């Protein structure tokens, strides 16, 4: 019967589609700033029989019996998260980054109260106040932005807005910003007006883990994150913070927002948190940051500047480069389509270019120099662009750094 | 590099705990009614490289490049759900049963508006209006229950409550009820008072798929479910319903409630929906139902009655049995602990007008889906029923050793996941 039959026998169309997606990941150059590649050991945990266990509640205080082994798993994930980030408390049950943020706002505020965050047009996430999301539907929203001249967040301007609006919760965090936030200034402003401070570090958490971006943990009431993105793990969420919020946050995740947690995915969170403390992971983060600096420099060279293309803030200190196309012949969709022709996946008069996934695959400075030159030539040279010559150079790079070499022979366990 | 190193090398403590949990599943008899066992093909989908893809939006309308293959995967899951259940639209993105219900309420009502559902004390779920869940925090709540004599939902009483309370949304659905809901009566009441009708079929979806429980789909505006529980798939949610509600429900899932979907888990949903249309799966549901009737019949016998034990509603028509213990020496927690000693996993459950506190109770909920998946039929269910009845009826003379030996004999005769240690991530 079908309980022990391979996927190839049970569902031939899904088996073929898994093979096609693996091929696409191997053949293309992935430069979406929010994406990465999980290690073999995380695939194994996500494919485990822990999916079968119902574990509503917390370790040692569950609805049902038989949780002895999954309770040790959840405690390894909590205790590794506290140690890696230097936090007082952790909850490792959120299903996603969005579900982590819904639980934090449930714990710290009530419907109708005031929420202050970074504007969508200026680099914020949809969970920081967008009108159709829970963050906009339930709460009264105010926003801060970036200085129009420097393109940096001006903390004197944030201060004046907070004193006027008097928010209950202030969010620091972003989906598209190219520099380092001042967490000590955010703490000072929240204290003045009696607000709680949430930092949403989803994009930059792996930089924090390796010691290459300043930590928000000393300064924040609560910190939310994805375990995917720069942290390099399986698709899910996580919360850490000060001890005084432990009961508020636990009760908001369950039974506030969720039912049963995904215990196979929590096992993978413990694995990713162990990898994130290693010297190998720290070097990978350094190759990420050096690649982003190499691309930003190449796009500020005379040929690109003359075509009307500019780099937002004049550089980067993080894992991505933000590009403004409004004075060039290209719009965002046209630039995205042209890069697809030469084998590169990015996202959109703006364009965002990221380096985490290529660093994980093994690219260093020589390789990022070649990738930057391919992009610059496409954006600068207009009608005279040789798509075919640029595609062959991209496929040469991909072929030289194999992805998931040997996956076709790997076991579920052992 | 650690990118290609096995789990046993990278994290020996976690590898060891995976092997201990597999052994616990093999050695016990699982009878929690919300539990089941996924097939090999679903383990392989959930362990796939599809975890790496960002895919916010819907097929053909995404916010990221490179989604050509994951768009085909999502459309196979949507099309198989519509065909299996006879529904006009499907959304296959919800992360869980709770997340499916949060999106439905976001689409159909506004904060402060009125919600009517089955009480927790009478077998409802916490997402049907419990005070400290979203369903109680955001909305004004009213409840219906079961009759104190018959233990059934009385639709004349549900109608009277709906006429007085005038809800915006009525929920029909349960976590612990032993009989068949009257969906045509719920539609009539909703139409009378101008309410929308949500059916939450999480517990009984696999019975509906096999044609062995009447379908809510012709009668409901929207239907929510888990893909785990009787449907037999990986841990996740699903929504199906009338085309009238498609645009609002899609917008409520994203950007209303969620961000990126879990594409590896959605591949596994497509696999579980294909299995659920097969004759093999229909036979498994027939064995689930026949096994539960055998357990109820054995408990309704002179030895068990004389010990102070009865069956709620005097029987069952679904995948579970509700036991009433209040005239016996055992409270619900005590009975749950005794059965664990003899190798069987169940959970405590509140009875009608229960005299004990809600965290202790005077009852049990006993389920058959997980053991039917493992291969049990009528012969095996007759033996487990006798083990349970003997434990509950013999008082201080119970022989735990003799009963535990009978349970482990059944576990060894029906191996679970035999050969898993040799199976590959991809291929055969
Ligand atoms: Mg309305």
The residue annotated as part of the active site, out of A78, A187, A196, A229, is: A229
- Within 13 Å, how many C-alpha atoms sit on residue B9's CB side? 9
Which of B7, B64, B264 lies at the smallest CB-CB distance from A45? Answer: B7
CA distance B297 to B313: 12
The Å distance, Cα B239 to ligand 1 centre, comes to 20
* DSSP-derived pairing of the beta strands B29-30 and B344-345: parallel
Same domain, residue pair B188 and B283 = no
**Probe site for chain B from A1, A2, A3 (most B CB atoms < 10 A):** A3
The shortest C-alpha distance from B92 to chain A (Å) reads: 16
Given B235, B257, B277, which residue is the final one in a domain? B277
Question: Cβ contacts of residue B4 below 8 Å, gap of 6+?
Answer: A39, A40, A404, A405, A406
Same domain, B270 and B346: no
Task: Please check whether residue A144 is in contact with residue A118, taking contact to mean a CB–CB distance below 8 angstroms.
Answer: yes
> Hey, which residues does A241 pair with through a beta bridge?
A89, A222
Type and span of the H or E element at B388:
helix B378-393
| Phi, psi (degrees; rounded to nearest 5) at B316 | -155, 150
Query: CA-CA distance, A355 to A369, in Å (whole number)?
Result: 12
What is the rounded distance in angstroms from the CA atom of residue A328 to the CA atom of residue A106? 45
Residue of B159, B235, B242, B406 with catalytic role: B235
- Residues B261, B307, single domain; the answer is no
- Whether residues A2 and A44 fall in one domain: no
A226 given a catalytic annotation: yes
Give the H or E element holding residue B381. helix B378-393
* Same domain? B46 vs B28: no
The DSSP code for B424 is B
Ligand 1 center to B209 CA (angstroms): 32
Number of C-beta neighbours around residue A140 at 10 A: 14
State the DSSP code for B350: P
Q: Are residues B184 and B330 in the same domain?
A: no
Are B374 and B268 part of one and the same domain?
A: no
Asked if residue B371 and residue B235 are part of one domain, the reply reads: no
Q: Is A341 a catalytic residue?
A: no
Residue B412: its H or E element:
helix B400-413
Q: Do A210 and A173 have their domain in common?
A: yes
Alpha carbons B363 and A147: distance in angstroms, whole number: 64
DSSP designation for B231: G
Are B344 and B326 in contact by the 8 Å Cβ rule? The answer is no
Q: Do A35 and B54 touch (CB under 8 A)?
A: yes
Torsion of CA B168, B172, B173, B174, to 10 degrees: 90
Centre a 10 Å sphere on the Cβ of residue A243 and count the other Cβ atoms it contains. 9
Full 3-state SS string of chain A = CHHHCCHHHHCHHHHHHHHHHHHHHHHCEECCCCCCCCCHHHHHHHCCHHHHCCCCEECCEECCCCCHHHHHHHHHHHHHHHHHHCCCEEECCCCCHHHHHHHHHHHHCCCCCEEEEECHHHCCCHHHCCCCCHHHHCCEEEEECCCCCCCCCCHHHHHHHHHHHCCCEEEEECCCCCCCCCHHHHHHHHHHHCCEEEEECCCCHHHHHCCCCCCCCCCCCEEEEECCHHHCCCCCEEEEECHHHHHHHHHHHHHHHCCCCCHHHHHHHHHHHHHCCCHHHHHHHHHHHHHHHHHHHHCCCHHHHHCCCEEHHHCCCCCEEEEECCCCCCCHHHHHHHHHHCCEECECCEEEEECHHHHHHCCCHHHHHHHHHHHHHHHHCHHHCCHHHHHHHHHHHHHHCCCCCCHHHCECCC
Q: Is B140 a catalytic residue?
A: no
In chain A, residues with a C-beta closer than 8 Å to the C-beta of B260 are: 96, 235
Please state how this structure was obtained.
X-ray
The CA–CA distances, whole Å, from A77 to A265, A267, B2, B426 equal: 11, 7, 19, 28
Q: What b/e string do you get for B315-349 counting C-beta neighbours within 10 Å, with b at 16 or more? A: bbebbbbbbbbbebebbbeebbebbeebbbbbbbb
B20:A69 CB<8 A: yes
Tallying the residues shown for chain B, one arrives at: 428
**How many C-beta neighbours within 10 Å does residue A112 have?**
10
**To 5 degrees, how large is the angle CA A338–CA A344–CA A348?**
65
**Going by C-beta distance under 8 Å and a sequence separation of 6 or more, which residues neighbour residue A279?**
none
Query: Which positions ≥6 away from A263 have C-beta within 8 Å?
Result: A50, A51, A53, A55, A70, A73, A74
Which is catalytic among the residues B78, B80, B168, B229? B229
Q: How many residues does chain A have?
A: 414
Q: Which of B277, B312, B345 corresponds to the end of one domain?
A: B277
Burial of B170 (0-12, 13-18, 19+ CB in 10 A): buried
> For residue A186, how far is its CA from the centre of ligand 1 (angstroms)?
38
Closest of A98, A90, A44, A6 to residue A407, by C-alpha: A44
User: Would residue B139 show up in a list of annotated catalytic residues for this protein?
Assistant: no
Resolution of this deposited model, Å = 1.5
User: Do B318 and B402 reside in the same domain of the chain?
Assistant: yes
Helices (H), B142-262: 155-165, 183-193, 205-209, 246-251
User: Distance between CA atoms of A258 and A266, rounded to whole angstroms?
Assistant: 15
Q: Among A62, A49, A66, A68, which residue's Cα sits nearest to residue B339?
A: A66
Instruction: Measure the CA–CA gap between B360 and B331, rounded to whole angstroms.
Output: 7
For chain A, the straight-line distance linking the first and the last C-alpha, in angstroms and rounded, comes to 25
CATH code for the domain of A162: 3.40.640.10
Same domain, A223 and A205: yes
Q: Compute the nearest-CA separation of A285 from chain B (Å).
A: 14
Q: How many domains does chain A have?
A: 2
Nearest to A256 among B134, B259, B423 (CB): B134
Residues B256, B290, single domain; the answer is no
Residue B52 belongs to domain spanning: 36-277
Q: Binding site for (6S)-5,6,7,8-tetrahydrofolate: what residues of B are annotated?
A: 120, 124-126
Q: Is A60 annotated as a binding residue?
A: no
CATH number of the domain residue B304 falls in? 3.90.1150.10
In angstroms, the CA A16 to CA B107 distance is 36
Question: Domain end: A277, A311, A332, which one?
Answer: A277
Kind and range of the H or E element at B324? strand B320-324
Count of CB atoms within 10 A of residue B307's CB? 17
């Amino acid at each position: 019967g079908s309980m022990s039959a391979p996927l190839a026998e049970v569902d031939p169309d899904i088996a073929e589609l898994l093979a096609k997606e693996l091929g696409r990941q191997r053949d293309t150059l992935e430069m979406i700033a929010s994406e990465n590649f999980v290690p073999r050991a995380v695939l194994q945990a996500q494919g485990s029989v822990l999916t079968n266990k119902y574990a509503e509640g917390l370790p040692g205080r569950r609805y049902y019996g038989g949780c002895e082994h999954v309770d040790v798993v959840e405690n390894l994930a909590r205790d590794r998260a506290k140690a890696l980030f230097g936090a007082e408390f952790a909850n490792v049950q959120p299903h996603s980054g969005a579900q982590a943020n819904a639980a934090v706002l449930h714990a710290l505020m009530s419907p109708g109260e005031r929420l202050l965050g970074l504007d969508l047009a200026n680099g914020g996430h949809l969970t920081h106040g967008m009108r159709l999301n829970f963050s906009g539907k339930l709460y009264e929203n105010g926003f801060y932005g970036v200085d129009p001249a420097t393109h940096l967040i001006d903390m004197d301007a944030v201060r004046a807005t907070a004193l006027e609006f008097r928010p209950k919760v202030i969010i620091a965090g972003w989906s598209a910003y190219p520099r380092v936030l001042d967490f000590a200034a955010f703490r000072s402003i929240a204290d003045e007006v009696g607000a709680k401070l949430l930092v949403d570090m989803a994009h930059f958490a792996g930089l924090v883990a390796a010691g290459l971006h300043p930590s928000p943990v000393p300064h924040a009431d609560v910190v939310s994150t994805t375990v995917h993105k720069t942290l390099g793990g399986g698709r899910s969420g996580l919360i850490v913070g000060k001890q005084q919020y432990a009961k508020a946050i636990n009760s908001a995740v369950f039974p506030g927002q969720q039912g049963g947690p995904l215990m196979h995915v929590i096992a993978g969170k413990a694995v990713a948190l162990k990898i994130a403390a290693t010297p190998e992971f720290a070097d990978r983060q350094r190759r990420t940051l050096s690649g982003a600096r190499i691309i930003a420099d190449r796009l500020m060279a005379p040929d690109v500047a003359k075509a009307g293309v500019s780099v937002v803030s004049g550089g980067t200190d993080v894992h991505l480069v933000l590009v403004d196309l409004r004075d060039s012949p290209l719009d965002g969709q046209a630039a995205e389509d042209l890069l697809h022709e030469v084998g590169i996946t990015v996202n959109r008069s703006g364009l965002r270019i990221g380096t985490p996934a290529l660093a994980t695959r093994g690219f260093g400075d020589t390789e990022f120099t070649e990738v930057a030159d391919i992009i610059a030539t496409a954006l600068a040279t207009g009608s005279s662009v040789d798509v075919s010559a640029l595609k062959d150079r991209a496929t040469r790079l991909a072929r030289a750094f194999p992805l998931y070499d040997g996956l076709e022979e790997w076991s579920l366990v052992g």
